[PDB]
Subunit: 324 residues, 3 copies
């Protein structure tokens, strides 16, 4: 009896109301584009005093569902194909030319050996290599990071979605939004919740992380957009909701392999018309954009079927009381 | 009785025949590469008369499951790190130097302020900034778009797929295809259905969109390849099928944030050996390639099980007639 | 009876033990970054003797969940916007200027026609085009491939994962790993199984492919990381496991459209300050990184429910013996 009304009454509240078994259900089809805005100033030793704008700090300019913002750098300029001593190291140090085999090439080395053992300094000798010389100096990335200004950068995240079963289209620029608003707004939980232009600092902060710390060696940030919509309700709900998680750093006890960095270059031709290269070991945050969602709507079919299933238990409650 | 043969007869037609419950079922593993071919000519004011080929208009050259084709541009050439007046704007206009705080930097501004209030023109003064100068002029993207020729571009979409349960491998270059055919063919529903080289114009047109309109501010195009295969049938069916949808523009009543654009640059060293930069605000279409599919095959197990389930209803039709 | 203990005993072994129906179950959230290390030497005709390092051979430097390594190249240098004869071809050959319509532009041609019919050689005439000239010569990619050294390249694959239900975080740099180890280790099934730095050669070899063959025209390699974890066991299991599959080449009987290649360029300004371009048709392997996994953990609920379901068959074994 209590078991009866408990079950019969349960299949309603539990499955039909709470779990909305009366609803037909779709998953979201999503597309996103992003644009980052902001300007960093750096004075280093020595490229001098320099600005970095969007075309400088987003590598590459375009990716589908993510963007990478440069935070820190180690820059080696005026490289050319030439010979130079490798950086001092147990595998690179030498005394005799015989230590360095010509043509010797190992994945972790600075180039292809000549092989001569040559002075890296007055204190130390190293195997000569054919490489892009000068080699990158061995040093820790600058703290504070050169691109600290990037905490204040903003990103417009534009997101189109559709729910095919329901022929329902929407965009995360809401209908109450307009051009002006985007001329000024920056997303805020309190004053600007419908602004899809987020401050990078706020993104990482809301994930309980410190941009300036994280900017030194770089990292990976998730931006999640959940579109969960009961289409029985007005189309005015069915708004995106935003969470921010840090993706990397899943074993913080390690000092092993922190952050995110990669190398890239800018090539030039010089007077003689021979190539020279600027190599950057860049550190930054990859912002990864992830869209999920499920739309429900009322349908009789799932209702019925779920009731057919529902009573199956309703009868064999008391039937099973005897069935033992 | 009618309910009997209706159910007993139903679990067969409905689930076993229509819904193929007698089949073991896999989902597709997919991989795609793409190559775009074509050449655009532009005469602008003034880079002059210029061609754009694949290495000019695909940014970047390589992405996994998508490609971006440049359609329109705003190009600012001969930039260097220097000082210049910001573009006229409620936030940038000034009268007194005191209006412009040195070091002032806001995400939406043209650079880092000096701050001096200087002439932007004879009519107007603006805060000076350290930036890449000259700044980009404020203007609408060219209509017609500079890259209109891109409607006639073609893209080879090569797609490998496998169904691991069934050890079934296939490629969207069909076995009846050959090298010559690819030397000439362009996909057509009527004459060239097995040509996997699609004209961009036809892609967007088939999605009921107008390439030249869409090329002005850019946009996002879905290309869907469904591989749905009943492996009971000959391996000669199990061909890919193509649909084309536009992904963005999901709230067309808005004038807010149309299309797709991003900024990127080309760096050079000049006489003095100081950097100069060409900044492009590029507009284009992102073509996004999406592969789905499910392979069925005959298996007795799903048959049996689905019958065990099937009769469960068959008996309690008439049993439930009494059960009330 | 045998059917009884067979079923009753079955729902335990089969579903609860083998299929672990007593477990709550999550799917993995994953993130990966990669870094490739190594240096190739090339002597070609004629860019001369040249090294290629990470900034030379990874195009682009950064992608989410994949990386592309250059293996072979065809390089055309000193291109500028100018006129030249198209490469000899049934569609490009001519006798009369009248064969070449000015402005004529077809997706598969070398440029925009002048149109004049001009000498491509002493033997042959071809339509003149406005293009980036000189055009790329028509030739087979070098065998052996210029970048054969890339077989010996290494890639650090760093992978963070979480299982939200279980609040479980881990990284594929295991807790028994340290900095030194990464200073030296390369992944080996036998001696270095916890080294997440893989030799490209070993990746393709383990997929039963030949790097040097595959390097000529390029290809696509899958790297799969399965994290399947029974969290009832110690967190010390729940290690990633690695498989390596080749993704493309799913119809090897074809000579049609082998491998992976794309075109890209490097732009320069010359003396006069007019653009010149190096065009590379690059061939290489796309390494695609794929992370899957399911974590189980003990929960009473799934246990109970699965028993409720389990006995449903247990009773109607002997009940159904009569039910016919
Ligand atoms: C384009 O799209 C924009 C975003 O949707 C629109 O902005 C919105 O405009 C409406 C009305 O114009 C704003 O309405 C709110 O009304 C509240 C009460 O108004 C009342 O005041 C009267 C006093 O005489 C009273 O008699 C009546 O009751 C009357 O209705 C205001 O209190 C509220 O203002 C503030 O409160 C919010 C905090 O909860 C905060 O969100 C607001 O933020 C906005 O302004 C601050 C600066 O003050 C900016 O920093 C933000 O960027 C933001 O612009 C504000 O603090 C407000 O007046 C509504 O707030 C507003 N939304 C936002 C967030 O802007 C534009 O109207 C649209 N433009 C066009 C042409 O349609
Ligand atoms: C490489 O791969 C290619 C693509 O699979 C192959 O092309 C295919 O070649 C076959 C046979 O060579 C073509 O066969 C068709 O046969 C039809 C009837 O043929 C009959 O004609 C005889 C007359 O004496 C008759 O006695 C017999 O009955 C004989 O069998 C033709 O009508 C058909 O031609 C046209 O009809 C199609 C419209 O429905 C259309 O698809 C065709 O398109 C092709 O040609 C046009 C130019 O005309 C091009 O613009 C297209 O790109 C395309 O090439 C055509 O309009 C056809 O002859 C078969 O059509 C053809 N498929 C295609 C699409 O090319 C090559 O044979 C392969 N090469 C090698 C070496 O194996
Ligand atoms: C940082 O992280 C590293 C990786 O986890 C650690 O390396 C590991 O260090 C442990 C102990 O230091 C190694 O332990 C193994 O112990 C075996 C038996 O040891 C026994 O020998 C004694 C003899 O007197 C005996 O009395 C005791 O029983 C004692 O315990 C060794 O046989 C084994 O060595 C070899 O066998 C393995 C083959 O199955 C092979 O994996 C090992 O590979 C390592 O060394 C080769 C060169 O020999 C390198 O090429 C590899 O890169 C690798 O470094 C080796 O062939 C071993 O001594 C354990 O093997 C080791 N793991 C690896 C793979 O390095 C470091 O200890 C950590 N560093 C710090 C500071 O904590
Ligand atoms: N990262 C960002 N931070 C702040 N504002 C932005 C950002 N991205 C875009 N906006 C602003 O939002 C509005 C719509 O952006 P959209 O990129 O569609 O237009 P746009 O004309 O290309 O923008 P812009 O030329 O200013 O980059 C514009 O007014 C634009 O300036
Ligand atoms: N976007 C495209 N439009 C038209 N034809 C194409 C396109 N992409 C490739 N093809 C042609 O399809 C065939 C196979 O392409 P694939 O790229 O595998 O060969 P390829 O020799 O690298 O081609 P190519 O050197 O002409 O770019 C070639 O004949 C190629 O010219
Ligand atoms: N592809 C690779 N092959 C071999 N070793 C690598 C590779 N990638 C990284 N390593 C080594 O693994 C360790 C951690 O890599 P990580 O990139 O996090 O550090 P890093 O200081 O940026 O490395 P590096 O400056 O040497 O590229 C470093 O010692 C690094 O040299
Ligand atoms: C560039 O190259 C020369 C040697 O080739 C070097 O001495 C000079 O300092 C470099 N200049 C720059 C750009 O720093
Ligand atoms: C480049 O720079 C100078 C000033 O630095 C400018 O006057 C000149 O017009 C520019 N030339 C080009 C490439 O348009
Ligand atoms: C570059 O251009 C000229 C013609 O513009 C050509 O004759 C010369 O050989 C080229 N030089 C190079 C870089 O090979």
């Amino acid at each position: 009896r209590f078991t009866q009304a408990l079950v019969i009454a349960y299949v309603i509240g539990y499955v039909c109301v709470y779990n909305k078994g009366y609803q037909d259900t779709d998953t979201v089809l999503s597309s996103v584009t992003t644009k980052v805005k902001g300007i960093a100033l750096t004075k280093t030793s020595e490229l001098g005093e320099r600005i970095w704008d969007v075309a400088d700090y987003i590598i590459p300019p375009q990716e589908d569902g993510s963007f990478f913002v440069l935070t820190n750098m180690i820059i080696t300029t005026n490289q050319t194909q030439s010979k130079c001593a490798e950086n001092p190291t147990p595998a690179s140090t030498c005394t005799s030319h015989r230590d360095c085999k010509r043509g010797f090439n190992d994945a972790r080395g600075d180039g292809v050996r000549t092989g001569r053992c040559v002075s890296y300094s007055a204190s130390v000798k190293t195997c000569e290599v054919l490489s892009w010389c000068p080699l990158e100096k061995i040093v820790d990335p600058p703290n504070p990071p050169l691109l600290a200004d990037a905490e204040r950068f903003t990103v417009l995240i534009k997101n189109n979605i559709r729910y095919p079963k329901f022929n329902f289209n929407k965009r995360n620029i809401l209908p109450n939004i307009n051009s002006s608003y985007l001329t000024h707004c920056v997303f805020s939980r309190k004053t600007d919740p419908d602004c899809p232009i987020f401050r990078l600092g706020d993104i990482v902060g809301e994930a309980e992380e410190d941009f300036q710390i994280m900017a030194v060696r770089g990292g990976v940030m998730g931006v999640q957009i959940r579109w969960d919509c009961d289409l029985d309700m007005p189309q005015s709900w069915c708004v995106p909701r935003y969470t921010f998680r840090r993706l990397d750093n899943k074993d913080p006890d390690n000092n092993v392999a922190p952050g995110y960095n990669f190398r890239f270059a800018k090539y030039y031709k010089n007077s003689d018309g021979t190539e020279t290269r600027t190599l950057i070991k860049g550190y930054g945050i990859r912002f990864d954009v992830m869209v999920f969602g499920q739309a429900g709507k009322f349908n009789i079919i799932p209702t019925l079927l779920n009731i057919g299933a529902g009573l199956a238990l309703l009868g064999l409650v008391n039937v099973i009381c005897d069935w033992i």
